[PDB]
Design a protein around this ligand. Structure first.
Ligand SMILES: CC(=O)N[C@H]1/C(=N/OC(=O)Nc2ccccc2)O[C@H](CO)[C@H](O)[C@@H]1O[C@@H]1O[C@H](CO)[C@H](O)[C@H](O)[C@H]1O
Ligand code: CA
Ligand code: CA
Ligand code: CA
Length: 1107
């Protein structure tokens, strides 16, 4: 390429002024808000050297009519009149340039559109809107090829672990053309560096063209090439289908430059200096300060009406983690906080799940969690909804150009995508406000699922910023799913933090520049996941690795959750207590993974600092990618080694909420992923002290040991993959108030003792044991007389209807019971040997082998009693008991909660009389049924359907069957045809067909197809040697009827006491009547609904004897 030339600059007709602080001077044009050049400490950086007195308004070139006033020594103002009659532009904007020390601020301080526009109202011509303002062509700062050390460094979005988003370009003549959007951009010489920020929500496209708030441009002036950094286009008045968006969607344009000399004392001036300085001018995502102390993220899941994780139970998990981590902070995402659980009731943010304890128990959880530094978040959706939701309406639904619905997720029900732009223009904000009003203060984060994939239309930079602002205004921190989502406002990205998702192309932000700037503010990065290669092959800063134990994607591994916190997250979070100050890359390496062989340049040393001038240095032990030392680091703190390879001994000087610890609460954590002795030098303020070591378990600090300090050093030869904590004085474990608010002490058997139970009988026959999944359970076995355990139920309300259940898995034929005595009345329920395996994926005692109770299976099911308090609630007791037997009964979870069911002879309490279930007051689940094995262990596609006329009912969008037969609730199964398996069944603990007695079972049902579902009678454990079943295939209920049909069956209890009834998915094909896809799913061809179940004990007389 030949040396390049361009026009020289004739400034004979230009009048310049200067504005200046004590350190920075800017030469500015009086004709237009342009900076010609900057001076700081006798060094210079150009701005926009060649005048370009044009702006682009609505993508039309306009020569503004400008008037100027120098306001004061640092500040100048420009009034810019904008007129283009052909394009209906008639407006004016005011711009200020202001120097603040080493910063230059560019602000549009006022915009007036002389066209009539009313936010929230119709506009008849959208071209009358003043929708975009661009000052592209006027660089805010630049560097010239004639300057020594001239370089540009910029970041773009990459989520591919093989491909850095960063460009590093020497500014030379000749050089390659450059006209490109960037998220972050720096220019520098050997003397000065500059960074640029803008609030522009411009996009040039997806991928690396998105979040492009800056544009870099090469311009040749005379014999020199300049690379300048411009703000990209800003947005202003916008509409959707003629409806002008709310005023809050308009944010005045702003940009800033910062200019700096060496800022990290390396005696070199480069982008890193600019990046340090940039932290003073940048936006900061709201809530970022919390991130560094949220060490233990996870999800607690509810789904399908089951109430797997009631709000108050989540507090007990918080207490386990508080003990086991010795007080590290937590972040629990409540996926299924609303409606019937996860993926129910979307858009109605304020509909806090009633079956998990409602707003009252949510409020208690938020408040009580504060002292454990445990922050709660919720999962919401702003992209799709279901007929059941209050906010389902034709107007909000997304339609394709052809008029068809854009169908969304199908799982419990068939959802339809919403039009997010319509939503914004029609009151979305108020839905957040309603949640805030109902819930109150103290919620930490809103995680918006799906958003950023386009299901709801535009989910790009501008639309995301608007959404985030609505959430942030309520006091909530923003979190999103995708690695590429929410770059401006997010603090957490699920597919960055859960390293398993998506594979190597779909991870966190692969940018050294961006991570240097923002590592401490968000979990948005590339973590250690060797099989992805590139940046994910042992990042020096770590990166959040999220696992779970409360039901998300079936996850239940408590011990592995904790090991993972210490293996990845403790050091990741340690670094976030500092800001990056220096970043050094090594020589390129060659890697082969994921179907390619490629080059990657790794970081070899990263330094960080804090406001106390502590210095952390992280060094990769080798640049050789084929050496084990490539995947090892050293970490020093003020030169003292705190990590070396597999082991660390790291200080922690912050409480669970991030507050500075008192001196006597300062501690160190030890963790080593390998066996072997390690030796550590103590800091001077430990070297002469006594030192005590504790093994951390789910019981807190254990196995106290005083260490021998020799020559200021300690040596630790401890268990691999086991956390320990060290202190300078003896420590104890506090009272945890297990299960506070739940009316009973420790109902998950987490406290290591049964001493708070009153035990009647031989106490040696009751003990806490661990399941095959390491989950604690009460076990009674080997007893020749009854064994009972009793507690008072505390804190109840007088004259109030309650439910209580215990989870029970009985391997004995002996009676295992739950009994409540209110003082005035006693009620009891029992089970003999359990006969139904547990298929609920989000429940910790499902039958997946790794969750198994014993013998590789789980038959846990909730065993209920229903009672009513009297006037005095000072002596209400709960007793778990077991009659004599050699085999074991296992119990876990005793939940007592308000309930208004009337199942027993039209009365609430457990007792005699005709059994009825109208599904209107279900405590949880699908009682008296339990989900069967039709889908295996799954987020079962059977739940309690909620009415929303007309959308849930026959006729809407051609629906063939009602979701709800009577009242507000029914029992719905979505699409589980042709499975040759049991959809659900009663169990004796929930309804016992007594030996030799006959019952009339009646219900109303909808069925979309003939003989796809059957009513069945069985006994004992169902086996799909297949079990004998009495089979009654059911006809469709709509081709010859305007409503649900009534079914009636006689059932006699087997002498073995183990008779049950249920609904079975036959082998027959369903009939979608020529419909397909979403229409076929929506319309209910493949569905079954039940309501108004009655089971009446009868004596067969007269014509009953004929059938
Ligand atoms: C998918 C996922 O991990 N989470 C939820 C979700 N994410 O949005 C997507 O677009 N996901 C996606 C990922 C890969 C390929 C296609 C799509 O969206 C869903 C709602 O649209 C749903 O909530 C996803 O979670 C699943 O939820 C079901 C129950 O509805 C079930 O619990 C699954 O185990 C979850 O992964
Ligand atoms: Ca430097
Ligand atoms: Ca009903
Ligand atoms: Ca539903």
């Amino acid at each position: 390429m030949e040396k390049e030339t361009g026009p020289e600059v004739d400034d004979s007709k230009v009048t310049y002024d200067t504005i200046q602080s004590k350190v920075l001077k800017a030469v500015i044009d009086q004709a237009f808000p342009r900076v010609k050049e900057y001076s700081l400490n006798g060094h210079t950086l150009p701005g926009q050297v060649q005048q370009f007195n044009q702006v682009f308004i609505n993508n039309h070139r306009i020569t503004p009519e400008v008037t100027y006033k120098k306001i004061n020594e640092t500040t100048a103002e420009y009034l810019m009149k904008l007129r283009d009659d052909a394009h209906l532009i008639n407006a004016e904007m005011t711009v200020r340039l202001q120097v603040v020390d080493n910063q230059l601020h560019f602000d549009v301080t006022k915009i007036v559109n002389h066209n009539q526009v009313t936010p929230g109202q119709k506009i008849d011509d959208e071209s009358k809107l003043l929708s975009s303002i661009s000052f592209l062509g006027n660089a805010l700062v630049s560097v010239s090829s004639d300057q020594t050390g001239a370089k540009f460094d910029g970041a773009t979005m990459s989520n591919n672990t093989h491909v850095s988003g960063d460009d590093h370009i020497d500014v030379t003549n000749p050089m390659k053309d450059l006209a490109k959007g960037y998220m972050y951009g720096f220019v520098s010489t050997d003397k000065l560096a500059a960074g640029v920020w803008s609030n522009s929500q411009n996009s040039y496209g997806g991928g690396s063209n998105d979040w492009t708030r800056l544009t870099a441009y090469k311009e040749t002036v005379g014999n020199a090439n300049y690379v300048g950094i411009h703000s990209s286009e800003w947005q202003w008045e916008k509409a959707y289908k003629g409806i002008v968006f709310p005023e809050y969607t308009k944010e005045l344009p702003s940009a800033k430059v910062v200019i700096t000399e060496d800022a990290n004392a390396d005696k070199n001036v480069d982008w890193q200096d600019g990046a340090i300085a940039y932290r003073s001018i940048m936006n900061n995502p709201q809530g970022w300060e919390k991130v560094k102390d949220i060490t233990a993220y996870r999800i607690a899941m509810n789904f399908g009406s089951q109430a797997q994780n009631p709000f108050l139970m989540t507090l007990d998990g918080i207490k386990k983690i508080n003990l086991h981590t010795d007080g590290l902070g937590q972040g629990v995402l409540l996926k299924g906080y609303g409606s019937e659980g996860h993926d129910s009731g979307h858009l109605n943010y304020a509909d806090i799940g009633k079956r998990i304890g409602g707003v009252e128990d949510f409020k208690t959880l938020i408040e009580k969690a504060k002292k454990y530094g445990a922050h709660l978040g919720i999962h919401v959706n702003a992209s799709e909804t279901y007929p059941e939701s209050k906010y389902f309406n034709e107007k909000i639904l997304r339609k394709n150009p052809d008029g068809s619905y854009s169908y969304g997720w199908n799982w419990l029900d068939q959802g339809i995508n919403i039009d997010a732009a319509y939503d914004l223009a029609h009151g979305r904000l108020a839905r957040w406000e309603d949640l805030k009003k109902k819930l109150g203060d103290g919620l930490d984060f809103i995680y918006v699922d799906v958003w950023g994939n386009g299901q709801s239309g535009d989910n790009g930079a501008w639309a995301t910023h608007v959404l985030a602002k609505e959430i942030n205004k309520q006091g909530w921190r923003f979190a999103i799913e995708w690695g590429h989502g929410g770059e401006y406002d997010s603090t957490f990205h699920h597919w960055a933090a859960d390293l398993t998702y998506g594979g190597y192309t779909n991870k966190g932000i692969n940018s050294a520049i961006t991570r240097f700037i923002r590592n401490h503010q968000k979990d948005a990065w590339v973590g250690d996941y060797r099989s992805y290669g590139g940046a994910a092959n042992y990042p020096l800063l770590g990166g959040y690795s999220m696992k779970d134990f409360e039901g998300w994607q079936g996850r239940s591994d408590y011990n592995g959750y904790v090991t993972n916190l210490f293996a990845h997250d403790v050091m990741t979070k340690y670094f976030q207590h500092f800001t990056v100050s220096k970043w050094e890359n090594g020589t390129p390496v060659t890697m082969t993974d994921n179907g390619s062989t490629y080059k990657w340049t790794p970081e070899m040393r990263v330094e960080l600092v804090d406001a106390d001038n502590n210095k952390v240095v992280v060094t990769r032990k080798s640049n050789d990618v084929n050496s084990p030392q490539y995947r090892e680091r050293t970490v020093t703190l003020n030169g003292r080694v705190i990590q070396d390879g597999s082991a660390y001994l790291t200080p922690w000087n912050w409480d669970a909420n991030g507050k500075k610890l008192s001196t006597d609460k300062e501690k160190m954590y030890y963790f080593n992923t390998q066996a072997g002795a390690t030796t550590w030098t103590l800091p001077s303020d430990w070297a002469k002290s006594k030192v005590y070591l504790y093994k951390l378990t789910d019981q807190g600090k254990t196995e106290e040991q005083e260490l021998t300090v020799k020559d200021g050093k300690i040596t630790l030869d401890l268990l691999a993959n086991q956390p320990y904590v060290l202190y300078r004085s003896k420590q104890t474990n506090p009272e945890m108030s297990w299960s506070e608010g739940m009316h009973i002490y420790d109902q998950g058997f987490n406290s290591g003792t049964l001493k708070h139970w009153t035990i009647s009988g031989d106490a040696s026959k009751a003990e806490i044991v661990k399941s095959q999944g390491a989950n604690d359970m009460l076990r009674i076995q080997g007893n020749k007389e009854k064994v009972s355990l009793t507690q008072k139920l505390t804190g109840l309300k007088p004259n109030t209807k309650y439910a209580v259940y215990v989870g029970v898995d009985n391997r004995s034929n002996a009676k295992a019971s739950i009994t409540v005595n209110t003082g005035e009345k006693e009620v009891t329920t029992y089970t003999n040997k359990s006969l139904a395996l547990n298929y609920v994926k989000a429940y910790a005692h499902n039958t997946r082998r790794n969750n198994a109770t014993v013998d590789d299976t789980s038959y846990f099911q909730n065993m209920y009693a229903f009672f009513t308090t009297g006037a005095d609630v000072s002596n209400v007791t709960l007793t778990l008991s077991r009659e004599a037997g050699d085999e074991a009964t296992y119990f876990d979870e005793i939940r007592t909660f308000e309930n208004n069911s009337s199942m027993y002879g039209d009365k609430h309490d457990t007792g005699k009389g005709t059994f009825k279930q109208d599904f209107e007051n279900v405590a949880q689940g699908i009682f008296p049924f339990v989900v069967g094995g039709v889908e295996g262990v799954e987020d079962n596609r059977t739940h309690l359907s909620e009415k929303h006329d007309p959308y849930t009912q026959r006729g809407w969008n051609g629906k063939k069957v009602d979701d709800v037969i009577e009242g507000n609730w029914s029992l719905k199964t979505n699409g589980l045809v042709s499975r040759r398996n049991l959809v659900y069944q009663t169990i004796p603990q929930n309804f016992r067909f007594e030996a030799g007695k006959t019952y009339r079972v009646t219900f109303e049902y909808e069925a979309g197809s003939d003989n796809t579902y059957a009513f069945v009678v069985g006994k004992g454990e169902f086996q799909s040697q297949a079990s004998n079943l009495e089979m009654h295939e059911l006809p469709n209920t709509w081709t010859d009827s305007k409503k649900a049909k009534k079914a009636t069956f006689l059932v006699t209890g087997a002498e073995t006491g183990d008779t049950w009834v249920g609904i079975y998915s036959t082998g027959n094909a369903s009939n979608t009547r020529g419909d397909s896809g979403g229409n076929a799913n929506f319309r209910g061809y493949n569905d079954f609904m039940m309501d108004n179940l009655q089971i009446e004990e009868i004596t067969l007389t007269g014509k009953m004897l004929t059938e």
